[PDB]
Design an enzyme around this catalytic site. Structure first.
Site, PDB file in Angstrom:
ATOM      1  N   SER A 186     162.914 -69.650  95.460  1.00 30.82           N
ATOM      2  CA  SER A 186     162.139 -70.846  95.165  1.00 30.82           C
ATOM      3  C   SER A 186     160.945 -71.050  96.083  1.00 30.82           C
ATOM      4  O   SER A 186     159.955 -71.646  95.653  1.00 30.82           O
ATOM      5  CB  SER A 186     163.034 -72.092  95.248  1.00 30.82           C
ATOM      6  N   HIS A 245     162.758 -66.165  88.496  1.00 30.94           N
ATOM      7  CA  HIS A 245     162.986 -67.541  88.926  1.00 30.94           C
ATOM      8  C   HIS A 245     163.550 -68.349  87.763  1.00 30.94           C
ATOM      9  O   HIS A 245     162.865 -68.564  86.759  1.00 30.94           O
ATOM     10  CB  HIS A 245     161.684 -68.149  89.444  1.00 30.94           C
ATOM     11  N   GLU A 261     160.249 -67.824  85.675  1.00 29.84           N
ATOM     12  CA  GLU A 261     159.055 -67.311  86.334  1.00 29.84           C
ATOM     13  C   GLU A 261     159.353 -65.916  86.862  1.00 29.84           C
ATOM     14  O   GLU A 261     160.261 -65.741  87.683  1.00 29.84           O
ATOM     15  CB  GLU A 261     158.609 -68.228  87.472  1.00 29.84           C
ATOM     16  N   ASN A 305     156.654 -75.118  90.095  1.00 29.85           N
ATOM     17  CA  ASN A 305     157.012 -75.964  91.229  1.00 29.85           C
ATOM     18  C   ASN A 305     155.776 -76.444  91.976  1.00 29.85           C
ATOM     19  O   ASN A 305     155.795 -77.526  92.575  1.00 29.85           O
ATOM     20  CB  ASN A 305     157.939 -75.213  92.187  1.00 29.85           C
TER      21      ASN A 305
END
Length: 698
Positions: A413, A434, A446, A484
């Protein structure tokens, strides 16, 4: 030079084989209108027939509905309404056939195709998992628009018909038979033989015409308004078209269905919805790299719990790939294995096949603590603790305990992939993959290649990601990646309003009305305040004070051990047993963090303040080439953080809003709220020139 052709059998029953000559799936093109007229006149001409059947020669499907390009080739509501009324008129000739007409459906039969089945007197479908009946025109901002808004309600009842039309949900054959939509569900071998056999053959409390059905529409309309917040125009017109159709007569409603189809096609919402549909099939077709994919016969998972169980669940059940889970905690393996069991114990609900297929998919799932079956794992997904030195050790373990061609896919992350691959013997076979928890629910992933990730393993990972039912985007190895990174300033701004006197009931409701699924801090609670705030320091050092948060808000919340919903309580209560009122809205959060203000801010000013911070960061990554294209950024935010689909994505929202106008808003916001709002370095350039992010700007 043909699409439908019919051949009568010895028994005078005609069979029309549906097969578009070249295209992979049967779609209702504009060219088919004259063909079906020419053959439906040949049926009436002979007058020596007993029945007729419809079959789809393509083994993939039945009919995938009308093509979404034909609606795009209309510049006015009259043209869109024209082919709509022509659609109902043609299928009225099919229902007016003195002969008995049956539709034999093998494979998917959605949209305008299901309407053709409604026009036929009877229907027969297969029990295959690939055959599904539905009306998903509402998902394109439109509406059935060819008889579906009146033929279907009088066959299944308005109560369960309205669900199919307002959501576009599709039903399976065993469930389709219960509703009466299909008259019989038979295996694919018996289909035609049974279809012609049937083709030879020649509550009331809520059924109160004036008040029993009136209550349904008052009750369905209130639900549908609350779920969509009025931001979807077709939702208003489905009830209106189907209500007047049932109340005031079929023919007067048909003419309302046509007018609805017309002006809905030119709505700004529908064109935004059809674009992300076109962008979704573009991503589903794009392999990310031109190299041939590596084999993916068996995979492995590093790490346990609900996190590892989700990756293994979608890997074996949805993608059909045997997966082992490696964890040194024996208890950590059981939670990863048990989570995948409870998913497949959905057989309690009328679905999920049975122990035949439940244990068939489950036999592909296994777990061990001792690395004994990993010597031939083509790819291994890492989902252990977010620590660089631990991830580097994981890379050093898979290369020593597995084959020399395995691919290391890290579910990180906030760590750069180049640092995870820094000490790898084969750094060509390490990539970022991800996911987002919950893994089964969230549909985006991702895929982050580092500087040395091979073009083969890039194409290999996405082939697995698409096999797991996920729509992947390939993003550069920069901090925060994309989804994010464009969400951290979005959440920080909502928290900064709390420290400025705002109430959380006002903020969350303001952004769900804007188009988001849930408010920013309810999102923060559901996903966890621990996880949602561990990336704000990473994005601070990587991009400056632009990703800053209030001084000590998050420092004060979780030092009170308020991790969100994952533990006892967070921004919302979750201790509301009795459940008189759903929304928890904890009032201990307000005194915990400083809040001098007293709610000057309005309702759209709140939702606009943080969506502009997010739009700023969105165009930043397309200028920094974090996302490969402006299309990857639209569906990356639409499926990623639930960007309002009726706006088409963050980049199609700028084009409609105006590149020059949005630069003026953020320059206006920057004067009032600080320099974190100042327009992106590239947005100012697009504000000067007539620059649109997408083709067909006018």
């Amino acid at each position: 030079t043909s699409a439908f052709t019919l051949n009568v059998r010895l028994d005078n029953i005609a069979v029309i084989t549906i097969d578009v000559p070249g295209e992979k799936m049967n779609t209702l093109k504009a060219e088919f209108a004259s063909q079906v007229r020419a053959i439906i006149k040949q049926l009436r001409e002979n007058k020596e027939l007993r029945g007729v059947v419809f079959v789809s020669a393509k083994p993939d499907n039945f009919i995938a509905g009308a093509d979404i390009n034909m609606i795009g080739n209309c510049k006015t509501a009259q043209e869109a309404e024209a082919l709509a009324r022509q659609g109902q008129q043609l299928m009225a000739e099919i229902h007016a056939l003195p002969i008995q007409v049956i539709a034999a459906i093998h494979g998917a039969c959605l949209g305008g195709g299901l309407e053709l089945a409604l026009a036929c007197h009877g229907r027969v479908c297969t029990d295959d998992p690939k055959t599904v009946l539905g009306l998903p025109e509402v998902q394109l901002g439109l509406l059935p628009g060819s008889g579906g808004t009146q033929r279907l309600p009088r066959l299944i009842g308005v109560s369960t018909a309205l669900e199919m039309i307002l959501t576009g949900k599709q039903l399976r054959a065993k469930q389709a038979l219960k509703l009466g939509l299909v008259d019989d569900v038979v295996p694919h071998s018996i289909l035609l033989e049974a279809a012609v056999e049937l083709a030879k053959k020649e509550r009331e409390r809520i059924l109160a015409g004036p008040l029993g059905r009136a209550l349904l529409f008052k009750m369905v309309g209130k639900k549908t308004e609350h779920k969509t917040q009025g931001n979807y125009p077709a939702t208003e017109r489905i009830l209106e078209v189907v209500e007047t159709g049932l109340a005031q007569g079929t023919s007067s409603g048909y003419d309302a269905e046509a007018r609805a189809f017309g002006e809905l096609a030119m709505t700004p919402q529908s064109q935004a919805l059809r674009s992300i549909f076109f962008a979704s099939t573009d991503v589903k077709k794009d392999p990310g790299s031109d190299a041939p994919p590596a084999p993916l016969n068996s995979v492995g998972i590093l790490g346990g719990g609900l996190m590892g169980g989700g990756i293994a669940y979608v890997t074996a059940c949805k993608a059909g790939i045997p997966v082992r889970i490696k964890d040194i905690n024996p208890q950590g393996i059981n939670h990863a294995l048990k989570y995948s069991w409870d998913q497949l114990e959905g057989k309690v609900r009328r679905r999920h096949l049975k122990a035949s297929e439940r244990d068939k998919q489950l036999a592909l799932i296994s777990g061990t603590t001792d690395y004994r079956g990993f010597a031939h794992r083509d790819l291994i997904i890492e989902a252990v603790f977010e620590n660089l030195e631990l991830k580097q050790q994981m890379v050093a373990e898979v290369e020593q305990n597995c084959a020399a061609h395995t691919i290391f896919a890290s579910n990180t992350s906030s760590l750069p992939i180049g640092d995870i691959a820094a000490h790898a013997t084969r750094p060509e076979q390490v990539i970022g993959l991800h996911f987002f928890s919950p893994v089964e629910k969230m549909p985006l992933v991702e895929i982050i290649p580092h500087a040395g990730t091979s073009a083969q393993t890039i194409a290999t990972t996405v082939k697995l990601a698409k096999k797991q039912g996920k729509t992947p985007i390939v993003v550069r190895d920069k901090a925060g990646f994309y989804v994010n990174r464009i969400l951290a300033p979005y959440i920080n701004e909502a928290i900064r309003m709390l420290t400025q006197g705002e109430r959380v009931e006002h903020i969350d409701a303001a952004l769900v009305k804007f188009g988001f699924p849930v408010g920013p801090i309810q999102l923060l609670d559901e996903v966890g305040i621990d996880t949602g705030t561990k990336i704000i320091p990473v994005l601070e050092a990587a991009y400056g004070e632009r990703f800053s948060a209030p001084a000590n808000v998050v420092s004060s919340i979780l030092n009170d051990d308020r991790k969100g919903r994952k533990n006892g309580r967070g921004f919302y209560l979750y201790g509301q047993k009795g459940r008189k009122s759903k929304k928890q809205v904890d009032p201990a959060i307000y005194p915990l963090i400083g809040t001098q203000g007293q709610g000057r801010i309005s309702a759209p000013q709140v939702a606009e303040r943080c969506v502009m911070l997010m739009l700023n960061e969105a165009v930043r990554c397309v200028d920094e080439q974090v996302i490969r294209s402006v299309r990857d950024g639209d569906i990356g935010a639409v499926f990623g953080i639930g960007f309002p689909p009726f706006l088409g994505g963050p980049f199609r929202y700028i084009d409609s809003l105006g590149a020059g106008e949005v630069v003026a808003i953020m320059q206006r916001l920057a004067t009032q709220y600080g320099s974190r709002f100042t327009p992106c370095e590239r947005l100012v350039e697009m504000g000067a020139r007539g620059e649109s992010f997408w083709k067909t700007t006018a």
